[PDB]
Amino acid sequence: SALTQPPSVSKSLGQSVTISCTGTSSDIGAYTGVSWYQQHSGTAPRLLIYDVSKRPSGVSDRFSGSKSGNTASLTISGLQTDDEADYYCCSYRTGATYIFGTGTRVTVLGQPKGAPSVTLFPPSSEELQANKATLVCLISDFYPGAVTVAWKADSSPVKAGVETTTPSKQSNNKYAASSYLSLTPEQWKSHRSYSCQVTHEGSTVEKTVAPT
Amino acid sequence: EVQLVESGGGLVQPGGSLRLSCAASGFTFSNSGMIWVRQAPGKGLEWVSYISLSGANTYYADSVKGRFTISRDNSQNTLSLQMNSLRVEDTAMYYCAKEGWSYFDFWGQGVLVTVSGASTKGPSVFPLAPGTAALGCLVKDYFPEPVTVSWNSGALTSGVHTFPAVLQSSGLYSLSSVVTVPSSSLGTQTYICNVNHKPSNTKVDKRVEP
């Protein structure tokens, strides 16, 4: 009842990849109303291919489509970092309804490593007057999209009060994440300093703030 | 310059109702079919409903029939989706899309429909005080998504980085928006973050100074 796609497909920069879309004889097997859509994280889908193999103006000829039986296929040549997105096939079905694929995430591998840029903010005076304390650790511009965050008060570990996001791709095709340390104003002022430690690959960058 | 501007959406109780709207321009809203497509976080796209250029023919997904209604106004150039008896599983980003011919060029930006028993909470906004200096705004403890942040009411866009929200254990979201600015503008240029949380009609302007 769904158009079957590979959950994930990955190749390296410059290489070509092919994504399959397997449906039934009631859709892909029956019609030419097959279309493909590109969707980057946090954006609306974008038409890549329509009518099995046609390209709208604005789509590079690196994107191509074909069909054979109940399986449609999208090929991306010269894999680039922008091609790193989610891809959906679509087809008209018999009850004049439409049906989308399960989606495929394309990862392009041989990209340059990127060290995380870290900005650490102390609790604001406004938040402290409100009997709250939040440390804000902002982590940007790193690749690949895996990082580990650890918090220190003076020089000792903090396990409680820490909330950290999953990495997300930015507009620069690098990654960003954020970590939040929840504190009592006294906790913040009792220690000499607080630190956010960001460890990417093997290197570890540290930022430090003090209640001056 | 075809546009599909969506509106509506927000937090609705389970069993509740919501109507989504899509304002079309830049093309004859007639002569074209329209669809609604939704996307649960973080799942794939699923087709919801189809309407022909006249409205004569309408089609629904089985997961939606009897509860969702599609309609269009060919004078107002608007597309609508009336949603009744909503469930937690109906929680998704909802897209409107123009049809060409059995394909769909041009999509709306999407609006988030959140079906939950949780209550709305507006965020508290705190300033993160500072060649190039980093400063920002903490947007703390709100529900549900989304939140928008602008700087100096749209004047400042370069160097602006708004981070995706963290989902706390409390069930509340928090994000931060940081802008890198020339240190020479500090103490001359005023920097105000403009935070908007529509589900609670919260609009906060916070001045960020060193």
Side-chain angles (χ1 to χ4, degrees):
Chain A
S1 172
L3 308 181
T4 302
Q5 296 184 231
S8 316
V9 190
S10 76
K11 303 291 269 196
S12 300
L13 280 171
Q15 301 181 345
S16 67
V17 79
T18 286
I19 301 165
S20 65
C21 173
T22 298
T24 63
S25 59
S26 295
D27 39 82
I28 298 180
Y31 308 101
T32 55
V34 180
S35 47
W36 287 91
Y37 303 91
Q38 181 188 62
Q39 183 185 35
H40 290 99
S41 66
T43 60
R46 175 206 169 193
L47 174 72
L48 286 180
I49 299 286
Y50 67 94
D51 289 347
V52 180
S53 62
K54 297 174 184 173
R55 248 184 307 108
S57 291
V59 177
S60 81
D61 59 294
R62 305 190 298 105
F63 297 97
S64 55
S66 65
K67 182 171 80 107
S68 175
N70 306 341
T71 297
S73 179
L74 172 73
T75 299
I76 314 174
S77 300
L79 249 13
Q80 296 176 14
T81 190
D82 295 340
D83 295 334
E84 204 154 84
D86 283 27
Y87 293 86
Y88 297 85
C89 55
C90 180
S91 183
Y92 172 96
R93 198 175 265 173
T94 294
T97 75
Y98 287 86
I99 205 276
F100 280 97
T102 51
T104 294
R105 185 161 304 195
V106 168
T107 299
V108 189
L109 278 181
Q111 292 174 58
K113 298 296 185 69
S117 175
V118 180
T119 307
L120 177 63
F121 288 106
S124 54
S125 57
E126 288 78 353
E127 191 190 3
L128 291 174
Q129 296 169 358
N131 197 41
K132 291 285 171 282
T134 303
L135 270 62
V136 185
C137 193
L138 297 172
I139 320 160
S140 311
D141 290 330
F142 60 89
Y143 190 88
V147 81
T148 288
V149 189
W151 289 88
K152 299 304 182 225
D154 297 333
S155 303
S156 181
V158 194
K159 185 68 175 177
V162 179
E163 306 277 7
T164 303
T165 64
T166 71
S168 65
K169 54 173 169 173
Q170 318 170 81
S171 57
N172 62 346
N173 287 327
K174 254 85 103 79
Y175 278 85
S178 42
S179 188
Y180 297 82
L181 176 62
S182 297
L183 260 44
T184 74
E186 296 80 9
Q187 270 170 318
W188 162 243
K189 292 183 164 303
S190 69
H191 299 71
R192 183 170 183 85
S193 84
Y194 274 80
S195 289
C196 178
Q197 273 186 351
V198 175
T199 295
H200 183 63
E201 294 299 326
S203 174
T204 295
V205 60
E206 178 180 4
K207 291 295 177 68
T208 305
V209 285
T212 293
Chain B
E1 186 61 17
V2 357
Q3 286 191 356
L4 293 329
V5 183
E6 301 187 43
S7 48
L11 178 61
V12 19
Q13 60 171 63
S17 295
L18 256 203
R19 179 176 166 260
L20 302 175
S21 190
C22 187
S25 46
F27 68 103
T28 298
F29 179 69
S30 317
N31 301 336
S32 288
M34 299 289 299
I35 57 168
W36 283 101
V37 175
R38 69 176 175 179
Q39 186 178 40
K43 303 304 194 289
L45 302 176
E46 85 158 318
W47 167 87
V48 171
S49 189
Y50 173 89
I51 192 165
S52 61
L53 60 88
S54 48
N57 297 315
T58 55
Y59 307 100
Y60 297 83
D62 293 335
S63 61
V64 124
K65 52 180 58 178
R67 299 185 304 126
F68 287 23
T69 312
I70 190 170
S71 77
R72 70 194 295 153
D73 189 309
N74 289 334
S75 287
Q76 286 310 112
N77 296 329
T78 50
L79 176 70
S80 184
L81 185 66
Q82 179 66 57
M83 300 181 299
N84 289 315
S85 303
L86 283 172
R87 324 188 182 113
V88 178
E89 303 84 35
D90 290 317
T91 302
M93 181 76 65
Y94 285 72
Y95 299 96
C96 72
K98 178 193 138 174
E99 180 194 13
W101 238 104
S102 293
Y103 65 90
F104 308 101
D105 49 15
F106 308 109
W107 294 57
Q109 83 279 7
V111 294
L112 188 57
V113 170
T114 306
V115 190
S116 169
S119 72
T120 52
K121 192 191 170 297
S124 302
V125 180
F126 299 107
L128 298 356
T132 191
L135 62 89
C137 282
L138 169 60
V139 178
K140 188 88 178 181
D141 293 330
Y142 64 96
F143 185 82
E145 296 267 55
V147 150
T148 61
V149 178
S150 65
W151 286 88
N152 294 344
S153 302
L156 181 59
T157 59
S158 302
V160 174
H161 188 2
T162 303
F163 286 70
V166 63
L167 181 55
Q168 297 154 202
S169 59
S170 55
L172 299 183
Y173 295 92
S174 286
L175 60 76
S176 307
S177 183
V178 55
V179 50
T180 49
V181 291
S183 11
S184 58
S185 291
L186 288 177
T188 290
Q189 182 66 248
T190 305
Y191 294 105
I192 303 171
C193 73
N194 319 112
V195 182
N196 200 255
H197 186 240
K198 284 188 177 176
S200 51
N201 41 83
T202 295
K203 185 182 188 303
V204 173
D205 294 322
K206 223 61 174 64
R207 174 171 181 170
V208 187
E209 52 186 339

